[PDB]
Write a protein that binds this DNA or RNA. Structure first.
Lengths: 194, 127, 214, 91, 25, 96, 94
RNA sequence: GGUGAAAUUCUUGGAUUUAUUGAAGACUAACUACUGCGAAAGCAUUUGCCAAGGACGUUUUCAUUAAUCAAGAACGAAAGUUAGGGGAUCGAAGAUGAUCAGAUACCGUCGUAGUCUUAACCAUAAACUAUGCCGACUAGGGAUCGGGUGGUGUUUUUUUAAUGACCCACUCGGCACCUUACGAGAAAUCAAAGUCUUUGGGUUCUGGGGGGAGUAUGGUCGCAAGGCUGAAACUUAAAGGAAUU
């Protein structure tokens, strides 16, 4: 169910005799048998887990923690990463470039793996057959196939009904609309071709 | 026993700027400009407007006993005109006549290495 | 409207021992109230002064230094090297057509963990008894001259920390041995040095930076 | 004999699915079916397994990368900028 | 006798004639 | 350049290709200088360096792969390490 | 048809094109070889220099000029009154 | 903020500007010249690597292996097309504010595709020196790029050994200039556009009045846009070139 691969890295317990098997998001350019340096005093290399508070500006970092102790919030999809714009020594925070092009400020004590997640450009080849889509969505949930609400029944959907086919009312749905009416465009500030 | 400053005259087109400030540059005084003493939309770069702006700047300069101030004249820079505005000479002459000590002139207009292609396109402006 | 002048104070800055002159002007600074603490905001500041002002002569007119403040102490804040630049009004003077321009760059380190971006400029001279018109370069002497000038400046900076690098930069003896060691390539007039840019810094390093004003 | 002149790899799809779809999946199939070499041996033995998997039968090294290309231009530029930053901090 | 614009009009006529031809075949 | 000296050696002096020929050559003592590619496994070139410094043999590092090493030495296949027993008409032992 | 060489371009290479400076008639110059009109006009115009010399805190020093290498006069400087239309005595210089 | 004048737009949430920087993309300004390379298009930071190319010198080699090109292959500006990366400035479309009787044009501000790169197409331009390639001769002069030769040449030190910077005289290969026209051209002009009625050195391609028309159709390549080949019917006595008042 994930286009990006999984990196299984075995760690060493510094407290007792044991070796911890960790599941990491597999970046690109990292190969099995290469040493992962997880910490703050490490060097800027692909696969390292240097916190954003100990790295300069402009570095590319994937799997960025939203808050310390969350252990993986941001940049978990294949071909995506996070760009750092700046940081402030007072009230330690890091400016990050979110994969959606959004702006978010998080603490400097958030760990992230340096590099880009492997499997980039996954959505470049169309799925062709319905079988590829069926196999793709079988491993995720029961969300396929999706039926149009305009070919529906009046009781089955607000968009259905009528001898002809038509949406009927405005497709845009207010944010404050109650559950059930949220069918179509939700809080659409603007529509049409971008 | 004299105190200096930076006036950083910004002689542009259709507007004139004078900004007397300390050498540090993080604290400034007398934000008066060419358009402060006129309402015409076309006489901002006129010598009279620049003279009035410098006179106001010089008057407000000696609030707590400021003696001298350095200047660094610059144009709009970038890739637009690369030449100082007509009001720059009138701006720097008005306060000098007003008793303000002037020195260490320095042409701080920015010049690029043929980058950031300017406004107009291939055939540019046509009149 | 409140009065900013009554809400702000005056400060005095002293140049390092690299320059014999000490006072380099007067900076207007807001009062360091407990809510804002403007005293620590002065750390990230620079002051630009002319070498002629800092030396008392007139041959340093086309030279100036920006001087970054490091530590503040009772209206007597001291400063430290940030980087010098050749004034652009003068920098457009020695460059003319019908001659060859020479530009070399390095990323050489020093003895005090500083990193500098040193550049240099060299020309071709219309020699005495010349009848020619342009005296252009062969284009391969620049290839032969770029390596030696970079080598000679890198060996000079290496083994000498920042203090004597500045104390010998102000006299401008750097271009003194360029010409004589390269008299076999070109006449090589106007070998005035170019910008030095300081990129990465070590920590605050209390005490040693006081010696420049001790 | 070169039975197909332009269709190439995507001849199983036949006449349907249109032209753009078949040609796009064809361009992708040439590079994702290509034989690569492991950066540690140099022999052309790397083959694709699962998505993002670049396995080998001789070097026995799996290098994670693009789902269809072992190293894209994005990989090159990110490696370049990361090594630039590493040099700058370590300088 | 503007060569460029009459030339562009000629290509528009080419477009229309090609459409007419493709209507039948 | 490295390639011209390597070709001059391959035309005049004797040579052993591969791993085990190289290891027997050095271990017996005839080898004077070994050539290791950049893509050689660390452990491999580390042991080679250990054998060389225990046998007092010079070491040179080559930036490149095995295929380009083979093309430089003059053999179309790939070679991970080579050694030179005598230069012959070459002088790579003296310089570098 | 006049203008045998038009400009000084006899070799090949096409050079490049730079933007025209404050003309309102900017366009793609036929290569960098145009009318130049380099200017060394002073930062301070004639007269009123006596006030500047007196007002200087330190004595002597100063008096530099603006060093502007111009490429703005190209095929439109007749409007700006820079390049003069001439006749068959154009053989002077180039 | 801008224009000849205005206006849209941004401004107590601080516009614009300044000082400390940091990030992204693009270019290689000043040096830049009747100065240089590449077959052409084209090339204008530093350094390393790889191969290739012109000229120079040769008392070294082959031996006429040679010049031009139907059919035929490779490069090929900008723009355009496919799929990624990137997407800072400018910016086909478009959204606005003018001036205008009218203005979806010139003028100001935003602004998608595009402008940069990758793999694969597109095979076009005022792609012009509007002047094909090879070879020989013909009035002179000066400057310049690369190389070479000779003159105790003037310089550079450790005056002097050398190198390199230049001087003088010359040579070859050039890009090219200045005065004149033996000669050509209808003239503009040409050191070739001369050596063509005193007609013939070798070779390839193109045109027989202007429109129709680079159009119809037929083939051919191309994802498409488009490229190559390429008419006829019908109409007119004028179209066109150089200089004069």
């Amino acid at each position: 169910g994930r286009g990006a691969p999984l990196a299984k890295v075995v760690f060493r317990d510094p407290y007792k005799y044991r070796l911890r098997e960790e599941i990491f998001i597999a970046n690109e350019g990292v190969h099995t048998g290469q040493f992962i340096y997880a910490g703050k005093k490490a060097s800027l290399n692909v696969g390292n887990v240097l916190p954003l508070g100990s790295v300069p500006e402009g570095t590319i970092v994937s799997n960025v923690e939203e808050k310390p102790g969350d252990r993986g919030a941001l940049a978990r999809a294949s071909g995506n990463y996070v760009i750092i714009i700046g940081h402030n020594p007072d009230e330690n925070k890091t400016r990050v470039r979110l994969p959606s092009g959004a702006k978010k400020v998080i603490s400097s004590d958030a760990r992230g793996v340096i590099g880009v997640i492997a499997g980039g450009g996954r959505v470049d080849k169309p799925l062709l057959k319905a079988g590829r889509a069926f196999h793709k969505y079988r491993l995720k949930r029961n969300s396929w196939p999706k039926t149009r609400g305009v070919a529906m029944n009046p009781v089955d959907h607000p968009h259905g009904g009528g001898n002809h086919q038509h949406i009927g009312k405005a497709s845009t749905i207010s944010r404050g609309a109650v559950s059930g009416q949220k069918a179509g465009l939700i809080a659409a500030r603007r529509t049409g071709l971008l | 026993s004299q105190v200096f400053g930076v006036a950083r005259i910004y002689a542009s087109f259709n507007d004139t700027f004078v900004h007397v400030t300390d050498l540090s540059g993080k604290e400034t005084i007398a934000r008066v400009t060419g358009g402060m003493k006129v309402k015409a939309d076309r006489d901002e770069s006129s010598p009279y407007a620049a003279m009035l702006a410098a006179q106001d700047v010089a008057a407000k300069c000696k609030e707590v006993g400021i003696t001298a101030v350095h200047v660094k004249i610059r144009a709009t820079g970038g890739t637009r005109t690369k030449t100082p505005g007509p009001g720059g000479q009138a701006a720097l002459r008005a306060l000098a006549r007003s008793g303000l000590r002037i020195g260490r002139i320095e042409d701080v207009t920015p010049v690029p290495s043929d980058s950031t292609r300017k406004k107009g396109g291939r055939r540019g402006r046509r009149l | 409207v409140v009065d900013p002048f009554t809400r702000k104070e005056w400060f005095d800055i002293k140049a390092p021992s690299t320059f014999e002159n000490r006072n380099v002007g007067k900076t207007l600074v807001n009062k360091s109230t407990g809510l804002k603490s403007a005293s620590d905001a002065l750390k990230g500041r620079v002051v630009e002064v002319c070498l002629a002002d800092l030396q008392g002569s007139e041959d340093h007119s086309f030279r100036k230094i920006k001087l970054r403040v490091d530590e503040v102490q009772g209206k007597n804040l001291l400063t430290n090297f940030h980087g010098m630049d050749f004034t652009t009004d003068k920098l457009r003077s020695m460059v003319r057509k019908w001659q060859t321009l020479i530009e070399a760059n390095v990323t050489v380190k020093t003895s005090d963990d500083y990193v500098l971006r040193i550049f240099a400029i060299a020309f071709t001279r219309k020699q005495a008894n010349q009848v020619k018109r342009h005296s252009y370069a062969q284009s391969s002497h620049i290839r032969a001259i770029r390596k030696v000038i970079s080598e000679i400046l890198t060996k000079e900076v290496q083994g000498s920390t920042l203090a004597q690098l500045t104390s010998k930069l102000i006299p401008e003896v750097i271009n003194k041995e360029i010409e004589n060691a390269t008299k076999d390539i070109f006449p090589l007039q106007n070998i005035h040095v170019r910008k030095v840019k300081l990129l990465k810094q070590p920590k605050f390093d209390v005490g040693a930076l006081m010696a420049l004003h001790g | 004999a070169k039975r197909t002149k332009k269709v190439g790899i995507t001849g199983k799809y036949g006449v349907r699915y249109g032209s753009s779809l078949r040609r796009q999946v064809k361009k992708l199939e040439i590079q994702q079916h290509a034989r690569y070499d492991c950066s540690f041996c140099g022999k052309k033995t790397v083959k694709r397994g699962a998505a993002g998997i670049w396995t080998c039968s001789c070097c026995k090294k799996t290098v994670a990368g693009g789902a269809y290309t072992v190293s894209t231009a994005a990989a090159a530029t990110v490696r370049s900028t990361i090594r630039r930053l590493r040099e700058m901090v370590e300088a | 006798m503007r060569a460029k614009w009459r030339k562009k009009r000629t290509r528009r006529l080419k477009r229309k004639r090609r459409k007419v031809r493709a209507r039948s075949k | 350049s490295i390639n011209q000296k390597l070709a001059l050696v391959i035309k005049s002096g004797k040579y052993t290709l591969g791993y085990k020929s190289t290891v027997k050559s050095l271990r017996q003592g005839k080898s004077k200088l070994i050539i290791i590619a950049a893509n050689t496994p660390v452990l491999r070139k580390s042991e080679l360096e250990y054998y060389a410094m225990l046998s007092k043999t010079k070491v040179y590092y080559f930036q490149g792969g095995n295929n380009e090493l083979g093309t430089a030495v003059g053999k179309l296949f790939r070679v991970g390490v080579v050694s030179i027993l005598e230069a012959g008409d070459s002088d790579i032992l003296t310089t570098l | 048809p006049k203008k045998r060489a038009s400009n000084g371009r006899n070799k090949k290479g096409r050079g490049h094109v730079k933007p025209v400076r404050c003309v309102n008639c900017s366009k793609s110059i036929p290569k960098d070889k145009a009318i130049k009109r380099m200017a060394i006009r002073n930062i301070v115009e004639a007269a009123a220099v006596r006030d500047l010399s007196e007002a200087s805190v330190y004595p002597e020093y100063a008096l530099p000029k603006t060093y502007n290498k111009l490429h703005y006069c190209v095929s439109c400087a007749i409007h700006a009154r820079i390049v003069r239309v001439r006749s068959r005595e154009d053989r002077k210089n180039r």
